[PDB]
Amino acid sequence: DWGYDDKNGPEQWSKLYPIANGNNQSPVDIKTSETKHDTSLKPISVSYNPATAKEIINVGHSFHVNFEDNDNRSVLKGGPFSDSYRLFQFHFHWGSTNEHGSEHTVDGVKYSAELHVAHWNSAKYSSLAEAASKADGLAVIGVLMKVGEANPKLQKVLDALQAIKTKGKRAPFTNFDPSTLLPSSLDFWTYPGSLTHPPLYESVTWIICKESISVSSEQLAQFRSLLSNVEGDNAVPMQHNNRPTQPLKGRTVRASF
Ligand SMILES: NS(=O)(=O)c1ccc(C(=O)N2CCN[C@H](Cc3ccccc3)C2)cc1
Ligand SMILES: [Zn+2]
């Protein structure tokens, strides 16, 4: 299959997934001198119901927190969108050291981690599986995480990790509103892009917050403590899971501010 190590990592993904060399690949470096302000961009509005939080899962290369997505209890609206988008999961990316780990970069600056909050177009489509490969099917909020003070909002997520230490492990994760993880200012950049790992579908409208959130060095250690192996095998920590930034290929990054 695919991964983040030497033989199966980002540099080699194009062999199984040709779209990796596509025209709408993510993530990107946001150059602030080259962004175009857009007055038509409405403010981002998120309205999430904590009752939709369902489950936390170790997926080998990462972990996901999944949400019930059968109705519109948890929605994203506004920004560049006419359609309402339904929350389905959030997850993080991180790096081997504090010096890197984010996927998106801003004026060449790499952050320590990045939060992704993913949604699918339920106005246009009937399911995530239908939406996933569509140009307007997915919307992901990206939040850059800067190493510094411990983030108490992250704690419930971090506390849950001891129950899903190895690949394939899953556990209930309930009564959680992930808008509590977002920065106070929702000023954003947006561009048309892709999933940042296989299958790399060019189906994502990216919403990148200009304001970062904090994470401590020890909080990052907890991410890196997660194991990629199945229970009983020799422990293989998830050291990193961030893709290198990709060519803009003439796309414009728009700013709401
Ligand atoms: N980093 S990112 O771009 O924000 C990103 C967005 C969505 C997903 C995701 O939900 N999955 C991808 C892996 N297989 C699963 C099923 C799946 C496959 C394809 C599309 C959606 C979901 C779940 C992963 C990464
Ligand atoms: Zn992601």
Helices (H) and strands (E) in the chain, counts: 3, 15
Q: How far is CA 210 from the centre of its chain?
A: 15
Within 6 A (CB) of ligand 1 lie 89, 116, 118, 132, 140, 195-197, 199, 204
Q: Which residues of 2-17 are buried (b: 16+ CB within 10 A; e: fewer)?
A: bbbeeebebeebeeeb
d(CA 162, CA 255): 39
Ligand 1: nearest atom to the Cα of 64: 10
Cα-Cα-Cα-Cα dihedral sign, residues 218, 219, 222, 224: negative
d(CA 110, CA 95): 10
The CA–CA distances, whole Å, from 103 to 70, 84, 93, 220 equal 30, 26, 7, 15
Residue 135's identity, in one-letter code, is A
- The contacts of residue 22 (CB under 8 Å, 6+ apart) are 194, 200, 202
240 known member of a binding site:
no
Ligand nearest to the CA of 198: 1
- Ligand 2 centroid, distance to 91 Cα (angstroms): 6
Structure solved via: X-ray
Tokens of residue 103, six digits:
């996927």
Rounded to 5 degrees, φ, ψ at 202 are -90, 65
Please tell me the number of Cα atoms within 13 Å of 237 on its side-chain side: 11
d(CA 85, CA 65): 17
Tokens of residue 242, six digits:
């961030």
The domains found in the chain, sorted by start residue, are: 1-257 (3.10.200.10)
Give the residue, by CA position, lying nearest to ligand 1 atom 5: 195
Look-up of token digits 């320590």: 112
What is the set of active-site residues? Answer: 61
Look-up of token digits 């939080």: 53
